[PDB]
Ligand binder design. Structure first.
Ligand SMILES: Nc1nc2c(ncn2[C@@H]2O[C@H](COP(=O)(O)OP(=O)(O)OP(=O)(O)O)[C@@H](O)[C@H]2O)c(=O)[nH]1
Ligand SMILES: Nc1nc2c(ncn2[C@@H]2O[C@H](COP(=O)(O)OP(=O)(O)O)[C@@H](O)[C@H]2O)c(=O)[nH]1
Ligand SMILES: Nc1nc2c(ncn2[C@@H]2O[C@H](COP(=O)(O)OP(=O)(O)O)[C@@H](O)[C@H]2O)c(=O)[nH]1
Ligand SMILES: [Mg+2]
Lengths: 44, 430, 430, 430
């Protein structure tokens, strides 16, 4: 700050589709094939 | 269980929406990718695992700004199909964006609004941003407000419109569509806040000491004001205020809901820490006429009601001791039929700083939303500008040929005359 | 137990089956060599529904493939999973029909059909408990629309108590590939109403619209349309091959979706469907499935379902989910859309839950709704038929093989009577 | 999206285009072989505005070249960047017009124009969303001023809602190269006012004056005049091909610069322009750009802009700069020169900012102002026309091809009426 113009200087410085069966691993939708068979909403 | 949806239409609206959405993401700790490395629920929604999606929609007929948004660092944040874009711009013609090309786009926007609203359970209201002096902005804002007022009814809508400066102007035809849009939102919006660029330029020059500002510096201040207004919904506070608790405190009559804002303190890190920033001095600075966020003089009119928000470590007794001092001063006078005119809110979360920005980090801040009788001057000067060219019917052929009738200009003039008469009738003492 | 046999005819039906059987084999873990390589125990418990057992432990579909020309079956054999089909079931002629309905139903189709009926009788007499037959064919071709429909009558005459399914592709006027489509469409619809227990119309135009708008893929091909049709086909019989909270065979759907014996023309749709780039954004929930399920653009037909009122509806949920949510959502989708549901039959939506989801997906829904909006397809088909027939255009080809114009007049009259009496209940009130 | 096609006619227009396309290709980094070799990502995002895509990855301009003689197009092909033009778009006759307007508009130009209109229709029907057309031609020649203006009417008759640009070189009396210039200038101005949405006059005399006084180069040639005209042409559509703070397409300029439909004759100018020896002395700042922009000698026309009052003005800044400085400088240039700005339309200067500067320059400005001082050019043209016509000099050449003196009288009367009604607003007061 002692009479700085650096701030002024900085401004100067700037001058058959198969996506149904293949949802992305990231997505919520993807359930593993191995776990495809737990059939109980109760326990889960 | 409290939500709000923000609507951004036009180039200015999108460019201020970007400004507010860096700030919200920074304030809630969300990375630009949307991933965190229970207060977020007001602006965001949880997808079940991982990222957060903003409760915002971007509208424009001209594709350049949206394409810039969809390639920047925030490409992963927004849902891909809520950035509605057109092909042909309205080109500053109000009749285009209200009668010709906006009608074919408005249905998709309304479908998106419904799809976002069905997710919310405690919807507080809507926010809308639009620069008034443009074709698509004003026209689509008018059409969206008119559709929402009948689709939903009593839900509250807030408008952060940016009116043209008294003498500084970028277009040559902006008074026409400014007057028409004021006509449209006079009977359709619950709150309208004044935001002309010249006052904020003067604020930056005097306080921030920037001699060459750009639009980003203006939009950051507007974003800070929005954050200060909506902080009370997502942070714990000793004296809370909700959005629905406004028309009962700032709006004396249904017609009068245009008010002008101010913010304090505004100071750079190079000289911020040399002074103590007490609550009394910041609340004095907030009431200074030169720190109004719209280029209007409050000394030329009475006050009707003042709603002013604090945040940080402020104590209520210090707030009362400062409201008394302001009531004492002889240069600030309130209207006769309002003995007390202050609504005070106190929040604990200090304002957040954006890296590489202008403002420094402080522990106390104040944001005021004040309704005053002096606002009639901007209406009078816009009316005078409108009359000069409407006397010779200049530029009218660009509007008549886009489906608008000849008489539509006159009734907006009559409504402005009615508003100016109403403002004079209210301000006289009994 | 309660298994069904597969019979397909024509080129379009053969191409549909070539993907339907691939989907079924991938679902049950059967390699293209007929060897089981699955992971779960449930994959083998009810494999007798579609597959037979032979020595050496391999499995063979109980499908019958028929066409009047050998090219399509000589081509499907070289494709993936083409070796599963038993060579004995391939029956074909040496001449073809040339898209002429008369040739494929009176002169050539009559002599050949004895051989295919022999193998059909062999397959049905042997099986443990018959449930019924499902038929895939196209109404836009001669040999298919002739031989398939005559085979329908021959099968119905011998098994009057079994159930009969037909998945029929009708020629849309938008994407037309054959000039003589109206004649053999109108002639086929006449015979199809008298014998088929269930009929499901599918349109290429709706499939292209879905592929272009929902999946947003650049270059659709017949493989994608076939894959969508195959997924929809598999979704109907899923609970008959897997355990669930409320099992519902085909006969139970027949009871609950057909109010009167002549109103059995349904239009279907499959959910969810999302683009590759947006498959990570979306979260799979019952509300998200049900909002897409009743979407008008999601129907597999160009018929607009908000142009009429549903007589009844059905949904076959897949995956493990709570029943209370399903029932409340079904109630909500029926309270908010009371104008589009006929009022003299209350509670006209059937639901079912199967605990085994599709491979790769956690939840899926198949929708089968009987609506009055289907009248528009027969209206346009009859309009084109009467526009072409009044000049006796292309009539000599049909009349040179023993057919006359009287059978055309009777077919037109019966089709118009069907159109009228299908909408008779739309205006009916209690 | 919102792209435009290029159409040029005559020798002068072909020579202007031969440099305009070179400038555009150098700006977008396209080699003379049609292969992209650019450095920045933005160089390819909006390349569909001017260039089409063909197999092999090369780009081809959507330009149409027409002339009544083959020499000029046979010469432009051998020049640099001459291979980009598609050979199919070259249309020419075997006779020529001989600077006779009647031959190029009634007898020869009428029969040939069907072929060029065919390719024009092919180009326009195909493109994604049409923005409009831009036309380059000279008013001092016969074939150009005839065929181009008749093509203007033919295009306007088929696309009444699109926008139309014309860059027209009018014959100055100082540097005269053809004796029959007044006749075909006066005849062309009659038709040009009725159909062109925008017109931009350019004079060779002003170009020589600029080259001799500002650039101070010893030997001007047509290549320098063409380069200046090309830079001015490119400056107008820069923000339509690049992002910026305030995008403004051609239609937005049309709305803001034309008060009445018959007042659409602008004069332009480009800044900065400095000599080779003084390019190191000067410092590029917004004040330096704006002081040269409004300089009288910098206009591309000999018309003296301080002999009249501006109806409106426009500026298209290029490069990254602060908007506050631009607005304050525009206000200052309007407060210090209030005598030269019409008083009944306040705030009559439009500004726009584009963040992409020209290659090799850090800042640039394109100026388009509608002023009343343009009357002097039509006055002198009509003076020469009436001096030559009163003796019926050279009239037989025109009257031998079906034209009569009545069309000369009507053209003179309409031109004089335009001159009068253009200055009518100069003396108008509020
Ligand atoms: N505060 C602020 N105002 C802006 C900004 N950008 C444009 N404006 C204002 O908006 C007015 C014109 O409207 P724009 O937003 O630029 O354009 P538009 O609303 O999209 O309307 P169109 O011209 O049809 O595209 C100008 O007078 C500016 O004052 C911005 O970034 N910040
Ligand atoms: N979904 C799908 N439809 C097809 C395919 N091949 C043909 N079609 C449709 O079938 C119709 C023609 O039927 P056609 O081949 O003449 O039947 P055929 O006379 O029994 O052989 C066309 O309108 C196509 O839309 C395919 O591979 N997939
Ligand atoms: N800027 C520029 N002007 C030119 C050039 N060549 C000719 N002109 C102008 O065009 C006028 C003659 O036009 P002309 O060639 O007869 O047009 P045409 O009849 O359509 O072929 C002259 O007055 C010149 O000033 C050139 O290369 N550049
Ligand atoms: Mg815009």
């Amino acid at each position: 700050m002692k009479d700085k113009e650096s701030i002024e200087k900085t401004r100067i410085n700037q001058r058959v589709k198969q996506l149904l069966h293949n949802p992305d691993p990231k997505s919520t939708l993807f359930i593993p094939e191995n776990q495809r068979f737990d059939k109980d909403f109760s326990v889960f | 269980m409290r939500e709000v949806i923000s609507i951004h239409v036009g180039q200015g609206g999108i460019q201020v929406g970007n400004a507010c959405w860096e700030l919200f993401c920074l304030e809630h700790g969300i990375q630009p990718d949307g991933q965190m490395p229970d207060a977020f629920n007001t602006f965001f929604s949880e997808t079940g695992a991982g990222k957060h999606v903003p409760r915002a929609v971007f509208l424009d007929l001209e594709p350049t700004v949206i394409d810039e948004v969809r390639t920047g660092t925030y490409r992963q944040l927004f849902h891909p199909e809520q950035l509605i874009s057109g092909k042909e711009d309205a080109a500053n013609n109000f009749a285009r964006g209200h009668y010709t090309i906006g009608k074919e786009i408005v249905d998709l926007c309304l479908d998106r609004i419904r799809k976002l609203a069905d997710n919310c359970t405690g919807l507080q209201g809507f926010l809308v941003f639009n620069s008034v002096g443009g074709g698509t902005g004003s026209g689509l804002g008018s059409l969206l407000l008119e559709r929402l007022s009948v689709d939903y009814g009593k839900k509250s809508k807030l408008g952060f419109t940016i009116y043209p400066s008294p003498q500084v102007s970028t277009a040559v035809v902006e008074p026409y569509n400014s007057i028409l849009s004021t006509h449209s939102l006079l009977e359709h919006t619950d709150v309208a806040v004044m935001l002309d660029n010249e006052a904020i330029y003067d604020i930056c020059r005097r306080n921030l000491d920037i001699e060459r500002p750009t639009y980003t510096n203006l939009n950051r201040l507007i974003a800070q004001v929005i954050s200060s207004l909506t902080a009370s919904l997502r942070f714990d506070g000793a004296l809370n205020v909700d959005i629905t608790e406004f028309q009962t405190n700032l709006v004396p009559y249904p017609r009068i809901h245009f008010m002008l804002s101010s913010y304090a303190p505004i100071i750079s890190a190079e000289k911020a820490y040399h002074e103590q920033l007490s609550v009394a001095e910041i609340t004095n600075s907030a009431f200074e006429p030169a720190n109004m966020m719209a280029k209007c003089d409050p000394r030329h009119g009475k006050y009707m009601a003042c709603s002013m928000m604090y945040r940080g470590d402020v104590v209520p007794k210090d707030v009362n001791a400062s409201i008394a001092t302001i009531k004492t001063k002889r240069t600030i006078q309130f209207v006769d039929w309002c003995p007390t005119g202050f609504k005070v809110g106190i929040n604990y979360q200090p304002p957040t700083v954006v890296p590489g920005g202008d403002l420094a980090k402080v522990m106390r801040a104040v944001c005021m939303i004040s309704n005053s009788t002096a606002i009639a001057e901007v209406f009078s000067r816009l009316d005078h500008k409108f009359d000069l060219m409407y006397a010779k019917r200049a530029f009218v052929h660009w509007y008549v040929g886009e489906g608008m009738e000849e008489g539509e200009f006159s009734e907006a003039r009559e409504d402005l005359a009615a508003l100016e008469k109403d403002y004079e009738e209210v301000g006289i003492e009994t | 137990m309660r298994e069904i046999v597969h019979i397909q005819g024509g080129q379009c039906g053969n191409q549909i089956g070539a993907k339907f059987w691939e989907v079924i084999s991938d679902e049950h873990g059967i390699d293209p060599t007929g060897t089981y390589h699955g992971d779960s125990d449930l994959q083998l418990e009810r494999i007798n529904v579609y597959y037979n057992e032979a020595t050496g432990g391999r499995y063979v579909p109980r499908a019958i493939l028929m066409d009047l020309e050998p090219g399509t079956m000589d081509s499907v054999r070289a494709g993936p999973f083409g070796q599963l089909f038993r060579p004995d079931n391939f029956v074909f002629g040496q001449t073809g029909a040339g898209n002429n309905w008369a040739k494929g139903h009176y002169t050539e189709g009559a002599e050949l059909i004895d051989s295919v009926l022999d193998v059909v009788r062999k397959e049905a007499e042997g099986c443990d408990c018959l449930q019924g037959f499902q038929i895939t064919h196209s109404l836009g071709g001669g040999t298919g629309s002739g031989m398939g429909t005559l085979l329908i009558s021959k099968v119905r005459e011998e098994y009057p108590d079994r159930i009969m399914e037909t998945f029929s592709v009708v020629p849309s006027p938008k994407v037309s590939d054959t000039v003589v489509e109206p004649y053999n469409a109108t002639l086929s619809v006449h015979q199809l109403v008298e014998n088929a227990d269930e009929c499901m119309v599918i349109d290429n135009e709706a499939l292209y619209d879905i592929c272009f708008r929902t999946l947003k893929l650049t270059t659709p091909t017949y493989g994608d349309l076939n894959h969508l049709v195959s997924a929809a086909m598999s979704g109907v019989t899923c609970c008959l091959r897997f355990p669930g909270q409320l099992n519902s065979d085909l006969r139970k759907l027949a009871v609950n979706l057909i109010p009167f014996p002549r109103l059995h023309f349904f239009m279907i749709g499959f959910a969810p469907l999302t683009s590759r780039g947006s498959q990570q954004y979306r979260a799979l929930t019952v509300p998200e499935l049900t909002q897409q399920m009743f979407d008008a653009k999601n129907m597999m037909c160009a018929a607009d379902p908000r142009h009429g009122r549903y007589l009844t509806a059905s949904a076959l949920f897949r995956g493990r989910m709570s029943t209370k949510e399903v029932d409340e959502q079904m109630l909500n989708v029926q309270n908010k859309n009371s104008s589009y549901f006929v009022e003299w039959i209350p509670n006209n939506i059937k639901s079912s839950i199967c605990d085994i989801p599709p491979k790769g997906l956690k939840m899926a829904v198949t929708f089968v709704g009987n609506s009055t909006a289907i009248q528009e397809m027969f209206k346009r088909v009859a309009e084109q038929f009467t526009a072409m027939f009044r000049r006796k255009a292309f009539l000599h080809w049909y009349t040179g093989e023993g057919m006359d114009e009287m059978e055309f007049t009777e077919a037109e009259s019966n089709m118009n009577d069907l159109v009228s009496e299908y909408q008779q209940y739309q205006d009916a009130t209690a």
